[PDB]
From a paper:
Topoisomerase II (TOP2) enzymes are essential regulators of DNA topology during DNA transcription, replication, and repair. Topoisomerase IIβ (TOP2B) plays a role in transcriptional regulation and is expressed in all cell types including post-mitotic cardiomyocytes. Both isoforms catalyze the reaction, where one DNA duplex is passed through a transient double-strand DNA break in another DNA duplex. The ATPase domain of TOP2 is highly conserved between TOP2A and TOP2B and is composed of an N-terminal strap, a β-hairpin that is unique to eukaryotic TOP2, a GHKL ATPase domain that binds and hydrolyses ATP, and a transducer domain that conveys mechanical motion to the DNA binding and cleavage core of TOP2. Here we describe the development of the obex class of TOP2 inhibitors that bind to a previously unidentified druggable pocket in the TOP2 ATPase domain to act as allosteric catalytic inhibitors by locking the ATPase domain conformation with the capability of isoform-selective inhibition.
We have been unable to obtain crystal structures of nucleotide-free eukaryotic ATPase domains, and to our knowledge none have yet been described to date. Therefore, a comparison of the AMPPNP and AMPPNP + obex inhibitor structures reveal that the obex binding site is pre-formed in the ATP-bound state of TOP2, suggesting that topobexin (9) fits into TOP2B like a key into a lock and blocks subsequent conformational changes that could otherwise occur upon ATP hydrolysis. Residues surrounding the 5c pocket are largely unchanged from those observed in its absence, suggesting the ATP-bound state can easily accommodate 5c.
Residue numbers in the entry:
A (entry chain A), B (entry chain A): 44 to 362, 365 to 432
Write the structure that this text describes.
């Protein structure tokens, strides 16, 4: 093999298709137990087989819609549609659209720049301490690259125009955008057909649809002041506590006693629920409406407070050694938080790495909350083990 | 704020400095309990404060050296030097050097291409089923970008020349390489001064040095057939079992009984040790000499086999329900494995996501190993809990 065959340089676009994993996660199937929202049973935990990268390209567009609530606090609604037969997914939001105007430096329409060129973002100036989920300038282009058809429609009264442009064939083909006069209520709608061949799939099957549906429920629970519709029907979740109820309101512990679920909205940026776990530590958490399914420093920040206080309570009835991991083993925690300029080790944003001193706010749980935590069965499980 | 201030495009090089986290991990301090190799006590677990991105740029160069054992199986030695006073780190390896010749497509010397331009690699052709750690074509450039001085020296008898080139100021300045006749024993040596200002550090302190030193011990344990020297002295680790001994050979369980450590080299590509944990599930694992500190499917693949067999043993003395997470809670596992074309969700490569069917080999632990596992205190811990 020649020097030129061995030592190769790739373009950014080539690298995404060759090495999709650090951009969207695995493009091969994964089977694991997890929470989904099924047509027959609603929220449930079961074995699911799905391709992470396909789930992620949907997530990128969904979080972008949630992020618009930061650009326009008057936004009220996100509508999600999934049609497996046609292979069409659409995510629509109201509030301010995207300026339909030529960017004077890049010499293209703003929506064409930020959906059709890599490393483009309104989130690159960190002197603004934003609580958007978007950080890197990739997500929407990644969905485009992994779609056979990707359409951006946006309407922005301030700039008096609407914009519609369609890309095809993994962002490699497009045509002139349709620009029209507009003076109505702003919106953005992203409609895409995922390139299932990139994920070795024949169709959007029940498992991936159940995961994408649950993500819409997550959004209804995490994005304050935004109602969510799925396939034309409003989701009956009106805040984080009602979302948490989907997991624990109808559940018993192993002794047949209903789970005691405690809750505190510490402040606008920190909403916490907690109950007993009997299958090891569990956490369901959101940072800026991103599902941080591998946790991060926000989870540790909340959990460490609870663990410290519960160790205190146990000690007052111990008289041998109760270690923090043993307490954490009995905790099921739910967190919805807003973090300024969060960091993650991956574009997938499953683990949030920013240290608490940089969050821009604190979550100092009240003594009332800690007392309630001492009554939800965790202490009893530990003390029974101190025998 | 104007459209041009709000909506911004970044170059690849700008994006690395603006968003370092998905390239090298966090550039802010982190404090946590972990294993390091200290000058006073050797291998020990203690609270450490360090900057992940600094540790990672060192790791990138170290794994590149290990990877040369795949290019040249005759390689025998890696030498690591760290001088905190001068702020100079060097990593040297023998075996084949890098061709000192002009790349006919890129029109630069091969070493200048692959250390000085992004997205350059000999690991981009996956039809070769390689067990190198390198996959993405970033690591060496990331170290260069995060160094105030970065020197590449390589000597390649086949091409009859040696090469030395120095970059400065975060890869933004360089000068003509020194090319000389060479007909000796090949080597490559990477010498760099990390840009401590990028990590808000004044010096390479004891904690970061102890982490980097432990990584050299990891390499002595994981890279078959390669001896490792640190600051001029050979590390007395001659294989994976002797490496594992640094953690467990002198340890007792909480009842005062020595840990029973079991071992099986299932085949050339899978080396496994296992013992009892009393602080929850623990894993120390390597994929292609990468420290997979967040685990991955290789860990799950090994652990699930052990858990399944130990549940069998417990059941034969149970007569209530023993759940897999409870068994895993008592396992400390050590894995050194070689995986073809591994995948990870991050450039940092802490979690290996490739499914076992794609590994290119299997690890089917023997019935002898499972019997030994049933005698290392895990079953006893579980059974005592079934009371
Ligand atoms: N629904 C939307 N409404 C308004 N603006 C949007 C919407 N979706 C995307 N944008 C804009 O398009 C830009 C590019 O989106 P995207 O590629 O996802 O990058 P990002 O969200 O800034 N960062 P990341 O998602 O971390 O890669 C965003 O920064 C927004 O300015
Ligand atoms: N010590 C070394 N000896 C020989 N070749 C080397 C050495 N270090 C680096 N290289 C070469 O330089 C290339 C670029 O290194 P690097 O930037 O780390 O990319 P990579 O190792 O291929 N992938 P990654 O580390 O996953 O980003 C490698 O692919 C090798 O061909
Ligand atoms: Mg985004
Ligand atoms: Mg490398």
């Amino acid at each position: 093999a020649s020097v030129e065959r061995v030592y190769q340089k790739k373009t950014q676009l080539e690298h995404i298709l060759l090495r999709p994993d650090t951009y969207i996660g695995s493009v091969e199937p994964l089977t694991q137990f997890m929470w989904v929202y099924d047509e027959d049973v609603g929220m449930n935990c079961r074995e699911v087989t799905f391709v992470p990268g396909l789930y992620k390209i949907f997530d990128e567009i969904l979080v972008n819609a949630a992020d618009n609530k930061q650009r326009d606090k008057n936004m009220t609604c996100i509508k999600v549609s999934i049609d497996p037969e046609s292979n069409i997914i659409s995510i629509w939001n109201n509030g301010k659209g995207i300026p339909v105007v030529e960017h004077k430096v890049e010499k293209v329409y703003v929506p064409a720049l930020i959906f059709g060129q890599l490393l483009t973002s309104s989130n690159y100036d960190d002197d603004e301490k934003k609580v958007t989920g978007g950080r890197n300038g990739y997500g929407a282009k990644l969905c485009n690259i992994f779609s056979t058809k990707f359409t951006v429609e946006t309407a922005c009264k301030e700039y008096k125009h609407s914009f519609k442009q369609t890309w095809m064939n993994n962002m490699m083909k497009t045509s002139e955008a349709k620009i029209k006069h507009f003076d109505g209520e702003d919106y953005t709608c992203i409609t895409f057909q995922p390139d299932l061949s990139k994920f070795k799939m024949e169709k959007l099957d029940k498992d991936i649809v159940a995961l994408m549906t649950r993500r819409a429920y997550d959004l209804a629970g995490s994005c304050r002041g935004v109602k969510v519709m799925f396939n034309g029907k409003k989701l009956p979740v009106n805040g984080f506590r009602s979302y948490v109820d989907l997991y624990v309101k109808d559940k018993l512990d192993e002794t047949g006693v209903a789970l005691k679920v405690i809750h505190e909205l510490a402040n606008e940026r920190w909403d916490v629920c907690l109950t007993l776990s009997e299958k090891g530590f569990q956490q369901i958490s959101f940072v800026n409406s991103i599902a941080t399914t591998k946790g991060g420093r926000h989870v540790d920040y909340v959990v460490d407070q609870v663990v410290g206080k519960l160790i205190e309570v146990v000690k007052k009835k111990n008289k041998v050694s109760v270690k923090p991991f043993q307490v954490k083993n009995h905790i099921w925690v739910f967190i919805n938080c807003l973090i300024e300029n969060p960091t993650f080790d991956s574009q997938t944003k499953e683990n949030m790495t920013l240290q608490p001193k940089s969050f821009g706010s604190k979550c100092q749980l009240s003594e009332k909350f800690f007392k309630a935590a001492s009554n939800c069965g965790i202490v009893e499980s530990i003390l029974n083990w101190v025998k």
